[PDB]
Amino acid sequence: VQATREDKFSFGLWTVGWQARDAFGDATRTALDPVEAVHKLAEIGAYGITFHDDDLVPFGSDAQTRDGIIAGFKKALDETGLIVPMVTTNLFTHPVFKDGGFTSNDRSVRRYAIRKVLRQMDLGAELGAKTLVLWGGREGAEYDSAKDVSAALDRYREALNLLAQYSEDRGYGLRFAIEPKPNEPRGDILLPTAGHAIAFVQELERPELFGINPETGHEQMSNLNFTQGIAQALWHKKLFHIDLNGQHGPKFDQDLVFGHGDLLNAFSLVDLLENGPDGAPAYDGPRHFDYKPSRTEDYDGVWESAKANIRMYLLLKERAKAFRADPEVQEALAASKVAELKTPTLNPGEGYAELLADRSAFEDYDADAVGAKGFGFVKLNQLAIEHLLGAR
Amino acid sequence: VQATREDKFSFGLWTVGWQARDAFGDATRTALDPVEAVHKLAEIGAYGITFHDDDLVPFGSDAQTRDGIIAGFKKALDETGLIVPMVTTNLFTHPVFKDGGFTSNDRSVRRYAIRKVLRQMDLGAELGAKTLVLWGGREGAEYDSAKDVSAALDRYREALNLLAQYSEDRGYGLRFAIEPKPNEPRGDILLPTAGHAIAFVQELERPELFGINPETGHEQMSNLNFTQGIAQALWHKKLFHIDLNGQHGPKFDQDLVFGHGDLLNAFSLVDLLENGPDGAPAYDGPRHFDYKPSRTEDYDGVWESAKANIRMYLLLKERAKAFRADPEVQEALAASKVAELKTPTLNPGEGYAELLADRSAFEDYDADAVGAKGFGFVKLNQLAIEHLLGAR
Amino acid sequence: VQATREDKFSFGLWTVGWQARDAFGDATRTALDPVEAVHKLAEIGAYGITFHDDDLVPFGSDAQTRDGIIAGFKKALDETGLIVPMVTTNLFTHPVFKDGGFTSNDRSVRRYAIRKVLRQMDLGAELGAKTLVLWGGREGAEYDSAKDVSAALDRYREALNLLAQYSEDRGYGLRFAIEPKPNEPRGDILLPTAGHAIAFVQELERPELFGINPETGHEQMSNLNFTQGIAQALWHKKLFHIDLNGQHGPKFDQDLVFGHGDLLNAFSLVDLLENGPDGAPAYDGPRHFDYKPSRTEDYDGVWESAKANIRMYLLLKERAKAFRADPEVQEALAASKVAELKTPTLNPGEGYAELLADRSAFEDYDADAVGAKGFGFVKLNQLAIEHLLGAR
Amino acid sequence: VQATREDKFSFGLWTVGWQARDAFGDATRTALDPVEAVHKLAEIGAYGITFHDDDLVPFGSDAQTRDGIIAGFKKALDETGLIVPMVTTNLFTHPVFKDGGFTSNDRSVRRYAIRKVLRQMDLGAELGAKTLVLWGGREGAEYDSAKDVSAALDRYREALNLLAQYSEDRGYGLRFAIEPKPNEPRGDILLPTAGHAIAFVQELERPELFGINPETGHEQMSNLNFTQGIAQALWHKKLFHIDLNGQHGPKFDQDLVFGHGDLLNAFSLVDLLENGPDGAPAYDGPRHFDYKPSRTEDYDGVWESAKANIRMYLLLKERAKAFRADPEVQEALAASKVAELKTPTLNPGEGYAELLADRSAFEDYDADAVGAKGFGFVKLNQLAIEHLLGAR
Numbered sequence A, B, C, D: 001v002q003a004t005r006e007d008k009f010s011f012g013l014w015t016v017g018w019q020a021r022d023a024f025g026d027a028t029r030t031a032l033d034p035v036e037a038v039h040k041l042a043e044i045g046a047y048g049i050t051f052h053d054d055d056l057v058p059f060g061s062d063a064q065t066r067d068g069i070i071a072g073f074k075k076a077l078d079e080t081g082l083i084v085p086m087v088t089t090n091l092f093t094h095p096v097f098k099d100g101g102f103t104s105n106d107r108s109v110r111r112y113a114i115r116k117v118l119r120q121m122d123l124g125a126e127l128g129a130k131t132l133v134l135w136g137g138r139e140g141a142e143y144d145s146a147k148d149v150s151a152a153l154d155r156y157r158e159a160l161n162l163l164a165q166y167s168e169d170r171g172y173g174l175r176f177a178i179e180p181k182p183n184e185p186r187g188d189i190l191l192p193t194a195g196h197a198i199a200f201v202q203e204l205e206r207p208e209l210f211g212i213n214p215e216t217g218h219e220q221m222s223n224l225n226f227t228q229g230i231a232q233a234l235w236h237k238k239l240f241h242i243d244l245n246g247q248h249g250p251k252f253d254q255d256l257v258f259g260h261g262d263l264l265n266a267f268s269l270v271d272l273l274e275n276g277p278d279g280a281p282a283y284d285g286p287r288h289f290d291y292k293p294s295r296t297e298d299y300d301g302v303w304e305s306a307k308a309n310i311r312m313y314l315l316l317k318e319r320a321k322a323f324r325a326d327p328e329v330q331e332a333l334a335a336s337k338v339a340e341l342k343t344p345t346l347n348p349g350e351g352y353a354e355l356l357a358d359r360s361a362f363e364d365y366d367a368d369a370v371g372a373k374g375f376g377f378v379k380l381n382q383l384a385i386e387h388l389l390g391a392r
């Protein structure tokens, strides 16, 4: 298959740029030039690139340096036609953030973290970014008595409310996406799942400007069903962005190519995002890959893995489409009553009193008879896998 | 230490009454009589008892029978001075509920599920219960194509809105507590974590009436920090009830005595609930034990395990109090800056314009120097554990 | 494709016969007659059937009743041509086994467990079974101080030595396969992984008569790589039997159809078993499905799920074959140096003296240059998945 | 309490020397001088220190420098009285080992790896070390088709056979301890659990020279019961060394202070090692702490955390002894029939013939009456915990 700008595949500069220095070893690859990343990505079919402030401008660069870098990067986007759909800020690498950015126990660190983000918001707006992703990687703790969670949530909220105020006042029109993660690098991270991130956002001052950026591996690190979690995020209308990658259950964050981890879940996910209501996708934003080319690879391996992500997504889409289009699947869906869940439980205008008066809903209901009918779910599931396998 | 009615320990009829019939073996204990249970629980110090409809009145009892049982039950309550703080409905045992109660693909089961709950609401109202716990144990799926998550959430919401309507029209004054669980019996259950449940509740018609009933073991089945999730629930003011028990990480639901699984987290949990805001508890509801006496035990074991739950709580409470009262702990808390998180990041009347004008929050900030100072968190953790072990 | 007797697909009577009573609810299906199960399995292409003593003959049947069941059973086998490749004993259902069979703390239970097994060996030997599977589902503990592991391993060994003795004396020619499981129904089960079982087997009086019966979901319950553990079992030559099914990581035992859990691991498992050394399979015993038709299904869903197991194995086999016959895959294998691992590290006749003498192995080794070459692993993994997807 | 040299507390140079560069951020601490390390550890009570070649002598140090470093190191040991009980080799950091050391697909890497170990064996022998720990951190894969496990086991064996040969011929008298780990840094590591490592060792040429070095955190990363695995290791007589630390279930390797993860399991572990048969410890090797001072800490937090490891072990020891000495515990052990498991199942001289003749073990056995009696395990567990809380 072939990727189009209409596919909206984006990559973080820190992905193909990952030098492969893990917690147990040194880097196996040399640094990638931002400008080269831009030309290579354009070439493999991506429509946009994302970056952390510190991925593009080395922490501590003077404005002369800083300015120079931005200018060149800007030219590259220009020549290639790539856009910057999202930007983020690094609030986890520097030792100052060892206890967090926004929720560090140290007050001075909190002030500093806000400033770092405001600045990145400025660059984002200049480059045309529409979404600010916030990954609070260091917000959390290793020991329960070290962090007052309530105070931490107040401080997270305080910081976010200021960011929305500024964006709205400067007219940047940004949307903010909170990225949930259960652990790593902190023992436990605040807002561990898509669920906790959504509940939190609901308490902000201008909640309509806030949503989440869920990551495949993050939810899988707690053994949760990523597809079901996205379905919930979509129900709430809080899916502002998405990070796609692969993981093999609860272990360190692997960041494999999308679909190289839980393949069956990767398939139900593409199905959910693409076979939305009335043909059209259920999701319209970037399909962003936040993965890492394995430590054992060289730059050849790097570009290969970049293309594998696109490839995986397009192969899955194709099968998800074929799945839904199959009259036998259509028949199995009917037998399993999947669409019957869309019919309200209650009749039009029916309330508690009418329901209480309906003898068929209780007094005269044959639970035993209904309890014996099968749902035909294994059969429908088998049909889906055969489509995935290209056997149908 | 001895239990008082003020401690508010409650137990489900189904905990001490569990016959220990598991997924791989027959029951090892005979049935426990409800009046007996009330009398034994009163004796060990419980202040209240809870039950699913079907735990008290056998599924399908005729009115005469049903009526007879309730009368006997109320008399035992009367005599012992035990109350019924919460009631729930069994929407998971009977085969009709194999694909869910409120979210079954089958429209007729959904209708029947609502009628079964209304009926239990009337009984709870009659007994003076204040909370209706809803555990959607069969809501979810084994296969992703079998359940439309979006339609399921619509139907779950449709049903809850009706229950609140009825409660409010009738003047019952009930509060509704949704109980999250990631899995078991279904592959994946809808609303898997405390977070997912809180986010959901914020979308109902009368949200002020809805909260959650998180269970220690359910959060631990996903390897999440239970204390930290309770802290967030308290921040949202949605902790309506709590189910206490023990678990050893992600595996089937063990339902051990509280404190017999993750002891360190059991300790931080009691500290959070009891060493509240003033000096006063941060949570005022029932301390409910939803556990199961191990299958290897007889009725002497059952009564021993019931008392063990109260004993673990009182012993942890005592050490949590001692921890907070220690001057060396006060000192370690001061060195770790725990309390500094409670001070707003911004000075009163400061906005983004004033922050941007503060050179010290960024332009002249010495991040390297701040990043070199230690938080002393290990030492604080070490004092906590020494209090737990009675080593101080 | 269609299954042939040469495929050696077998099913436990307890799989298609599971009535679906789980830990939270009643059975949803009526009991399956063993004769009927023989006929239906024959019909879908199974070559054999297996059973626990108690699956065929109800616990406590008098000798006339037991004899009658066995006779009708044998007749069905005869008429269909199905064989009984393995038999097993239920040492987990009856309350007497609540603390285990061979390792119960109670001496009398240990004596009775051995007698129950001996009696099953007789029946197995008479039906022609070649393997006795031993699943100690109840050997273990919920609490560390309740069980002396060392004493427990001594007792385990004590029982197994007797069984080997009896079999050898009677000329039964049975092979014994211990089945590891990490937990469920005990909090922790003895011999938790394929590794622990293999190490234990090695300490018996006649180790050559003992191997393991590893199950897909059981290793996945600990989030281990099943194919990789199977590879090691094959290296030790201890894979006497195999239980195939599906699971989604660490949670209760799901027993899904084979391939419906971790699809990618199912794929690599079929590759390992069939594309063995010298053209031929690496394993020649039964391909046994120890799964359960989901609780949502009726008897139609039961047979559909039995057939899904076979279809899943055959589709994966087909794709594994095509994978290996692809010149591009071969080229990738060569580039990744997979086969170079099969060449001894030392030259023929080289010892440490000569290795110490080779400056090319150290003194003149350019670690830095080798360290920069990519292995091309991602590209290889991508072709593997494109074969599975039927995209190649 | 206070540590004595008889407690045999040892620490790796890399533990207190960890600079805190994690997968997501820079080092927060400066480098620790080895001589200083020797001095600091002697002061807190350690009886020994251990290290990887590369911890002591910088990778790529000329002969002169290396020699220089060693001589200073020997002086510090001299001056302080600390010994080097164990030494290990770094086969995971340098880029050349990205695919492993001993089982790298690349043959030239395997040869280099052996050379690097021989050299450390010499230094080890010279410093008086008794054990060579082998941690194959890079032995494994991210993708199943990239590693022939069988070939890798052959190459692993091939390398160990040679090391044994060398050590025996040089008269070093070393014992070899293989350290299992399930994952991190490789997606899946070979010899993932204590079980797998023991099974492997049994296949070597001089098995009496090999054992294992299990780490608390490693077994817990797979959610296995550490104490139970150590109990099996002792049964096999393969506990050559042990790494103590803390972990919070399946997630990245946390390396917390011993007893800061699963407290209940740390208690049962100390009980097992110390309350050995004949009053005496069941294990007499070094109690080695392979942990990491949290990244939020400075050098003071570093020495605080080192002392915390010793304090935890000694406080647990103290409670394990009090527990065993309690008459009420003694009464609970008897009711639980813990010791009845040590009495053989068969009477002296009984074999299957006599067991078959015993009607009381089967024909006249009342399984129902035995099945109704409880084991009193909950009460026994509750007493263990009250001893741990210092409540008794």
Ligand SMILES: OC[C@@H](O)[C@H](O)[C@@H](O)CO
Residues within 6 Å of the ligand: A052, A088, A089, A133, A134, A135, A179, A181, A215, A243, A253, A290
């Ligand atoms: O787990 C790492 C996170 O996924 C980050 O890459 C964020 O998305 C950006 O800060």
Ligand SMILES: OC[C@@H](O)[C@H](O)[C@@H](O)CO
Residues within 6 Å of the ligand: B052, B088, B089, B133, B134, B135, B179, B181, B215, B243, B253, B290
């Ligand atoms: O996991 C089982 C559940 O916890 C139930 O006991 C609910 O709390 C009540 O239906």
Ligand SMILES: OC[C@@H](O)[C@H](O)[C@@H](O)CO
Residues within 6 Å of the ligand: C052, C088, C089, C133, C135, C137, C179, C181, C215, C243, C253, C290
């Ligand atoms: O998890 C249950 C076990 O898998 C059993 O089915 C054994 O294989 C046979 O007793």
Ligand SMILES: OC[C@@H](O)[C@H](O)[C@@H](O)CO
Residues within 6 Å of the ligand: D052, D088, D089, D133, D134, D135, D137, D179, D181, D215, D243, D253, D290
């Ligand atoms: O998880 C990392 C390992 O624990 C190492 O520290 C080894 O013990 C020494 O190579």
Ligand SMILES: [Co+2]
Residues within 6 Å of the ligand: A215, A217, A218, A253, A255
């Ligand atoms: Co990630």
Ligand SMILES: [Co+2]
Residues within 6 Å of the ligand: A135, A179, A215, A243, A290
């Ligand atoms: Co991300």
Ligand SMILES: [Co+2]
Residues within 6 Å of the ligand: B215, B217, B218, B253, B255
């Ligand atoms: Co539970």
Ligand SMILES: [Co+2]
Residues within 6 Å of the ligand: B135, B179, B215, B243, B290
């Ligand atoms: Co509960």
Ligand SMILES: [Co+2]
Residues within 6 Å of the ligand: C215, C217, C218, C253, C255, C290
């Ligand atoms: Co199973």
Ligand SMILES: [Co+2]
Residues within 6 Å of the ligand: C179, C215, C243, C290
């Ligand atoms: Co099995």
Ligand SMILES: [Co+2]
Residues within 6 Å of the ligand: D215, D217, D218, D253, D255
């Ligand atoms: Co470790």
Ligand SMILES: [Co+2]
Residues within 6 Å of the ligand: D179, D215, D243, D290
């Ligand atoms: Co270690």
